[PDB]
Amino acid sequence: SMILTQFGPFIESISGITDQSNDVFENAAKAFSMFTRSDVYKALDEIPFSEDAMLPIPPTIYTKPSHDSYYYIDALNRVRRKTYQGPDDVYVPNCSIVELLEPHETLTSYGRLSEAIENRAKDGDSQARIATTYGRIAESQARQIKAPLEKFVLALLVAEAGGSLYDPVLQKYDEIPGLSHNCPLWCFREICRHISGPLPDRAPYLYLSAGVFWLMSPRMTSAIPPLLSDLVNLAILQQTAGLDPSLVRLGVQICLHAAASSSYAWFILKTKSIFPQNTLHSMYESLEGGYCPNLEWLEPRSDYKFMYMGAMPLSTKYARSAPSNDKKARELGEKYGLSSVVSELRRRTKTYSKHDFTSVRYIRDAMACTSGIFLVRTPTETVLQEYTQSPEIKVPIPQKDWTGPIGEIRILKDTTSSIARYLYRTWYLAAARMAAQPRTWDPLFQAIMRSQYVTARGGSGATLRESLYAINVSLPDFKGLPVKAATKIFQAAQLANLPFSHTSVAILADTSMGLRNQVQRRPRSIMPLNVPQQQVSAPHTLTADYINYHMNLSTTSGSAVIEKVIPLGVYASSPPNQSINIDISACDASITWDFFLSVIMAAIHEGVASSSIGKPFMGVPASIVNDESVVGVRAARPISGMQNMIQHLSKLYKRGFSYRVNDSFSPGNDFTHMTTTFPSGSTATSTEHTANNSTMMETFLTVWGPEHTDDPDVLRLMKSLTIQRNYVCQGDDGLMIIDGNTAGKVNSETIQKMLELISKYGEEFGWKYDIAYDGTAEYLKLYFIFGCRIPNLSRHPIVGKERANSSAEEPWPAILDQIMGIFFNGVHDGLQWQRWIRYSWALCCAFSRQRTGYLQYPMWSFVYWGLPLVKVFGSDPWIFSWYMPTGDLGMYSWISLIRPLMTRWMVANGYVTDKCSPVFGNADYRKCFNELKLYQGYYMAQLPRNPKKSGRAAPREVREQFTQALSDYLMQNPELKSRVLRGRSEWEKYGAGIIHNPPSLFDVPHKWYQGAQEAATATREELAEMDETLMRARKHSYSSFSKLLEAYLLVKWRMCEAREPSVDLRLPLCAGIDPLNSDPFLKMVSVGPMLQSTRKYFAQTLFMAKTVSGLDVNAIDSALLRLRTLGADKKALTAQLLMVGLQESEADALAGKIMLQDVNTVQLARVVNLAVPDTWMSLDFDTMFKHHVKLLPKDGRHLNTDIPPRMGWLRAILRFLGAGMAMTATGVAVDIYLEDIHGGGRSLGQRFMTWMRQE
Amino acid sequence: GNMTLTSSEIQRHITEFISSWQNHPIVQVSADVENRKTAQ
């Protein structure tokens, strides 16, 4: 009840009870700021739990052994963990830690790692080294959380104190059990109580910036810090998603069993496919009904043209024909003592026989119940376990099938009986078609591809300088300036004047290490190659790009669920056309010099021979190299620059790679390691992986398959499908589509035999295909069943964050950004919208205050950041959806939605002004907004959230020689420099400063210098300046909004009739969205999902496909469109395009094209800084932008909404102005008609032009 | 003229939308499970 007493107004504010104001928000934020952890645990103890919330806790979590019997010292004086269960028992042991703690000062009941053991390990003791390695590794495991966990627990308590929430659409309260039924939260309380014991302190551990402190007690172990985060994640997911209690109890049982085992991370890795394999892989054993989408994707295939044609009922014969997954599931449940959970899951799964919403929600809950944490282990062990495996080639290429060496490459004669002939042919044709194809010789293309890898990020520069100084060649050093000295930009500046002959030695340097953790998967090591080593591998990635662009059917999709090929999964998961999931295990170590690289280098080498003689490639001169090709005689065979590139890359690939490992968690554990695995983190990795996958699948389907099969039906199936029609590969993973015939779906036995054939075929050249045939589809970690997406909640943890090194965390605005990212991730995953909004506001308030004086962010800043608001100004609660556009458009949308009530509310209490405003009328909006801090929050939200360590003082002439070095590196070909100088000349002649900052190639070194300086630690003065900036912004008073927002508010709209449905209301398209989730369900049904990949659709809008790194294509196109709208001569556009580096004829033609053509709304929108929000990109927004937003009013022309024939670009801005309002409001998306513009179309266009003449 | 956003205002659009969906000829006769005689 203390939560109620200390937070009364805040719950009523954020639960739709009363109005949502700023003073209550700030008081609640202050109370969050001053709230001790022990008080949090007391309030936790005040919870009156019930039964159904209690699950027995084994007594063996607390009583654990020590760490000495788990580690040892091998030869070469290295520290590593001995294994007890196979070769994967190399994770953190669950042993006790108490005997390694010395009490910290200023508080007795907490301690950290003792400095005595640290010193005794530093000077060379063995047991001390083991103890400190264990302590540091446990510290790293415990340090995998965004913020102190008590903040999240208290925010959940505050949010859930409100109880059930009313639903405006469903017209009833939501039936979700309260906190008294929260099993994980009760487990958290019990564990904390048992660990704390008689000691007054109750927190098992406290998480600081750098390092954490352990509360010493005999019951404390190393498995507690991940367990607590796991339970809190489960509790938050239960509260914000309506998870049923049984599945959450099963998940908590699994988590406790994992904690009680020998190793938490190892056990949770061994049991990571319990829920997905018992539930997702076993439903619909017997069907009687349901609806599935009747997708059909057109014969143009590389463009991914998908069409949706209604929904068809499910027949009984569309049951689960895949082989049963019972034996291995039962065996796994019996092995690890989880038989009860597996039996419960299997019994519960069989009770769902109809493809309604409930089964999909049950699947979503089951997949969400898995444990999502970032697994961690010592780098010297992941290096020793990942980079020592080698491929197993059972039928290698015969020795007689090669020829004499062309330098270090032997061409493979086409008379071979091996399967590598087809791979060699495909790569040879790809290389030839590249070399003949002419865009690879324009200097701009070479400059772009040379600047691809030049990035403000580490690239192992120390090894580069050591290797290059090993030949007594000296490179310049820069001292006194604040740029980072361990980045690839520094290497590029150092390698400016040097020719290729001197820098060719550094190609064989030893790469440094890298590491990053991942959810429910072993951490991946990454080797960044130095700048010349990126350079030397350009033809490989280029011909791989050609293969992946023309020869095969594949995609190179983006990171988020919005930018992905969702339609393909929906099509491949429909019942008539079942699909097969093909995955390659450990593809990094797969390809080596024995088979794959050996074929590929020769194919590339003689692919380019007869197309490019001379004409040196980027920074690599052509050279001479002999060959013993034919019988005995040897020639000199002059080669091009690309072939010298290939020779150097071939020696690098033939010898192997040297991998320096100098970790920090284990002292005295530095060494080197030679490995044969293909490097990860290189430019060419994913492209060649996908190309090889496609080529090998194609050759299997063509030649190898029929040569090793007997049955007629399987042969008929294999002759029917090809990779150009049904096979989509991206990197390691892949997906194959089997389409349905006239007689239903293809027989399962033929598919099983074909999969056995694939498994046999893959082992010939050292591949182990991980093939799953379960009736569902998996691709890029997306799960589909019967044409319905399923978001994996556990893969996106709420409190988790991966950290490899022991670096301290970023300041408070960074955690603000992280909370906003958490909210957006919750949006994409489809949670319970009301509860999720309330909890997001709770976290918002919790993390909104920080001392230095105190600094606070007024709620309105967070609203500007995109978080929707519940109930303000006395309006109806739960009135705005989260499809609100972020940014200015978003403010306009909600303000224009609620304006006629805002004015009434303002006037009703002491805000009256005689002056009349066209937007707000006679209400003193200025004083009200200044008092409400709305201006203050709106302006403060725009300030940068990172210290302005860029621009720090630097001694002169040193920055000058630095910038000169980058300028020389960027532009080695004189003709491109001539183009840039011309572009500047006609820009001075014609541009005349119409646009303030036109992008150009000369400013790339400045941007690179700023970026390289940015990646550095910020001094205390930079943080002080940041806090002073925030304080000054808060204290200041603002007269009015930004120009864009004031211009937007001049537009009025009207909403008459709702759209007709675009999707059947009985068709489950995605999990989590259903009648229980009113807003997303209605939004998707009224608008419709996007049935086209967003990547290509967004790509077709850009004028220029790609530009040099350090410049933005959006910036270039925005400058071009500003120079069109603000009247300017064509010559100005020609000068701008020349400054970008385009050739004079092409620049002239493109400027002439741009002058007169019209372009779709997206590009025109960019002119005023507007883009489609990342939230909308999961829906079919294009049709709404085209048709369902009409600029002509419903009652004809009003003579006031008269857009002139000039400035016709206003239509796109009006389209987003209407669409933001159409999408912000809850319920059905409604057709929206333009009503009135106050100042007139020409006046509003003049306002936009006078803003364009800025920036 | 000055139309705000209201719960009843959302409800009327919801009713119009659902009526428009229900008045679809295919939806009017579509069924997910067969009756006792269509199976025969």
């Binding site: 017209q171 109806d876 | 209201t6 719960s7 009843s8 409800q11």
Partner: peptide
């Protein structure tokens, strides 16, 4: 209105 939404001379006289 919200609750409704929830629920959903002498001579002349002579």
């Amino acid at each position: 209105a919200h609750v409704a939404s929830h629920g959903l001379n002498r001579k002349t006289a002579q």
